[PDB]
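Anyone opening a protein record will find just a pair of labelled lines. A complete record is shown below as an example:
=====
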Amino acid sequence: DRPSYCNLPADSGSGTKSEQRIYYNSARKQCLTFTYNGQGGNENNFRRTYDCRRTCQYP
């Protein structure tokens, strides 16, 4: 089944970094980019598009 966090909106978190990450947008059925600040946030946060697809898009 699709992991529950795949349904959460992207969360930039906190910190002094500026990292491009990937999240699953369930309404758009797409893995999309967002800016992560380096700490916190939620688990809908992938370093590689392919990992978002394997985990969330095609569970």
Observations:
- DSSP finds one helix and two strands in the chain.
- The longest helix spans residues 49-57.
- Helices lie at 49-57.
- Residues 1-59 form one domain.
